[PDB]
Design a protein around this ligand. Structure first.
Ligand code: HEM
Ligand code: HEM
Lengths: 441, 444
């Protein structure tokens, strides 16, 4: 009944324990030591970190707990505003935007984003095809170039052309500078300038599209044409801007991290790589993969789910108790008390996954119906789960499938995993050499 | 712009594509080929079948579309008359009965029907408790015995005593034969028999109304409510003949839709043993008294989710008809003229993958864990708007109660490895579904 709590530093409470470049990995070690629930305090704040499926399934009951705007989300809200990710569930724009955008993020909707995803995918594979013998690839760097550009094209038909440059388009620079500044807060002049660079570009694109009247296959067209069936209202131009900035912020790094971690696990487990590469060869028989072919990349999808099991790229999400309640028959909580779900620990719960939790075994996802409810939560929970989850997996399955069709990979530095933490996780410094199989592209 | 339509074969039009006694299932396969809307013609008519949530939301706009009496409903009107189910919305009795009966069908009103539901539910349990080792249960048959008797007791305090008989009470025999004849019409002896079945139904129900009025007895049934209610709008009460039509209508409209729901839920539970275990775990944790209380039925959350998921896959009154009130454009692409008919294909609506995900055929009650998050007009087992099922709270309270008791008292075996066979009439049901129950020996 008494909750464990790690070391306290007087009036600093537990804050000093997170004065580190890798706070989630430090919290996982605290979960290692204290078990399924621990208390964590900062000067005027309290949170309880949950690690076991037993307690997390109760936390995921939406009649009892709702998404909380953590301090990180409040700082990201200075530029993400009231877009989906940084809104309270009871804010009117959360509901409006959710009802309008849901159907445009469905698996069926991926069919209309497929060609633009392929356009950027092909640009990445062609870059690697064109490398000389004395060169290597910087994985996370190229995966981020890919994901940013794909979200810019599918989101608002805008080309960042990140594969044509050494220094990123100026929006990307301000966006990543903006996000790092908000994560560092856990400058002001630079922060305000970076907000303006983001709003100026996105506002201009929205004003240009409304002027032309053109209809394309992007999310902006859907937002300009959508009407919330409940209120009957469309989103205004400011909120559309925040949704756009939000797709980029929430989707670019989580998705590039997944691709980087999946390639990492594959070069470290050659037998799994070979099985995934043999599926890619059999399925992707055309020089341009089709939507239906990506859907048949089943083992590739299993590789991606297992990479997400071990290193879910948006690793913690925050909840608040809606009313007074008791968690797991043991821990009484009051209305408003906050819970943090530590996804990487949930995904290491030996009572669900077996004792081999640290092993990379995509075969765990062979039968998706066997995974207990709330045991696997890389996309968060319920109505506040990631709306971009079908987009992210289609993109990553498409791209990983193409990589495996076209190249053999070498882990030429015997890379040592070093997980860098920002809003998201990624394998910093991960580099490979790819040798082309010379297959038509 | 042009409406999709299946191949036409000269003067037979699209009729050769429905050479079946299971047209909704056949129609769902055409929706799978042609999409969210298709026109369907036969020499006699023209209708448009709608399957996506996006166009069904527009068809559900009551200022543009209203309930159409299909031909089945017109044939059923010969014995259901101007009861709520077979009336046009503009008929005076529709609006008077609607206003008067709404408060007797609310959730709150279920509190007063609860004891009578419990009465018939205990008889079903006792029947199954008393079977010998070598026996099995006919599911839709017993479920239909239960619903008819529950509707009879709660509707007009009449006991059909279906669990005491091999052959139903004469009223039931006549009602079900009258219904069958109505659907089969979609013959001189059929006609004479149909007039005899109408007289059996009317004579009994008229006699019971008259006995009630002559005694002044006040009971907990819908008949008392209709004898004493007055429409707040016109200030008038229902007359005796209309009261007879609503009693027949409750039985017609409620018996097989509700029995079909229970049968399909038990079918999905025995084909999905992990779900059945989770549901039975809730029934054991919640139903701690000898017989369930109203409050206990309301706390059977997972049991209600199982029932909703069964209604998502196989909505037991699967299609409803609408007519355009005025000229209008549907979905910004399809112009309709006043009077044009639409059919809502409920099971196909319920498989719209943009709403529910790609896994639409799976039985997963957890899809209903947070009802408020299901998109508007995505789940429509009770029809739409002011013409929606007035008996919906009654049917869900009954089913939740009965399935909760089933799961409390017995373990179930799908001893024939039953192959799902969906018979279509006015409703759906798993024809021939059979099971063995093993008592948990928990006394009532
Ligand atoms: C593998 C990649 C991804 C992962 C692991 C991921 C993870 C998550 C998680 C854990 C949440 C919930 C956060 C919370 O509870 O506070 C979330 C929400 C969200 N994500 Fe993703 N995400 C991914 C990709 C994307 C993409 C590609 C997009 C957009 C194109 C996107 C847009 C969003 C949005 C808009 C929300 C908020 C939804 C709402 O609350 O209504 N994400 N994501
Ligand atoms: C799960 C069981 C049930 C289902 C799936 C169901 C379904 C429906 C549907 C879809 C409609 C609309 C028909 C149309 O638009 O043509 C309807 C109407 C109706 N149902 Fe139900 N029903 C069920 C149970 C009941 C019960 C138990 C009763 C009575 C005790 C009942 C009585 C009625 C009546 C009177 C109407 C006509 C309402 C009006 O138009 O004013 N139903 N039902």
């Amino acid at each position: 009944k008494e909750m464990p709590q790690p070391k306290t530093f007087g009036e600093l409470k537990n804050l000093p324990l997170l004065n580190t470049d890798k706070p989630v990995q430090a919290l996982m070690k605290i979960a290692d030591e204290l078990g399924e629930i621990f208390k964590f305090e900062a000067p005027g704040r309290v949170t309880r970190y949950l690690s076991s499926q037993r307690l997390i399934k109760e936390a995921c009951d939406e009649s009892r707990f709702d998404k909380n705007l953590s301090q990180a989300l409040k700082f990201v809200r200075d530029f993400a505003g009231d877009g989906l990710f940084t809104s309270w569930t009871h804010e009117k724009n959360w509901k409006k935007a959710h009802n309008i955008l849901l159907p445009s993020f469905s698996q069926q909707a991926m069919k209309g984003y497929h060609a633009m995803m392929v356009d950027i995918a092909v640009q990445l594979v062609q870059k690697w095809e064109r490398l000389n013998a004395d060169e290597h690839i910087e994985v996370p760097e190229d995966m981020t170039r890919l994901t940013l550009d794909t979200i810019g094209l599918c989101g608002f038909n805008y080309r960042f052309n990140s594969f044509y440059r050494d220094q990123p388009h100026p929006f990307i620079t301000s966006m990543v500078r903006a996000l790092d500044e908000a994560m560092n807060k856990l400058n002001k002049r630079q922060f305000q300038e970076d907000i303006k660079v983001m709003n100026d570009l996105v506002d201009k694109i929205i004003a240009d599209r409304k002027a032309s009247g053109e209809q394309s296959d992007d999310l902006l067209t859907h937002m300009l044409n959508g009407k919330d069936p409940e209120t009957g209202e469309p989103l205004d131009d400011e909120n559309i801007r925040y949704q756009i900035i939000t797709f980029l912020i929430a989707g670019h790094e989580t998705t590039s991290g997944l691709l980087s971690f999946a390639l990492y696990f594959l070069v470290k487990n050659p037998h799994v790589l070979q099985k995934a590469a043999e599926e890619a060869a059999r399925v992707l028989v055309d020089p341009v993969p089709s939507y239906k072919q990506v859907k048949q990349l089943k083992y590739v999808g299993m590789v991606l789910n297992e990479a997400l099991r071990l290193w879910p790229t948006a690793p913690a999400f925050s909840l608040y108790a809606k009313e007074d309640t008791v968690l797991g028959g043991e821990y009484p909580l009051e209305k408003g008390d906050e819970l943090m779900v530590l996804i990487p620990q949930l995904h290491r719960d030996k009572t669900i996954w077996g004792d081999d939790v640290e092993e990379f075994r995509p075969e765990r996802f062979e039968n998706p119906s066997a995974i207990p409810q709330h045991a696997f939560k890389p996309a968060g929970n319920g109505q506040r789960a990631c709306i971009g989850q079908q987009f992210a997996l289609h993109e990553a399955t498409l791209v990983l499938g193409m990589m495996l069709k076209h190249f053999d990979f070498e882990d030429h530095t015997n890379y040592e995993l070093d997980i860098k933490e920002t809003l998201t996780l990624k394998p910093e410094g991960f580099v490979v050499k790819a040798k082309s199989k010379k297959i038509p592209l």
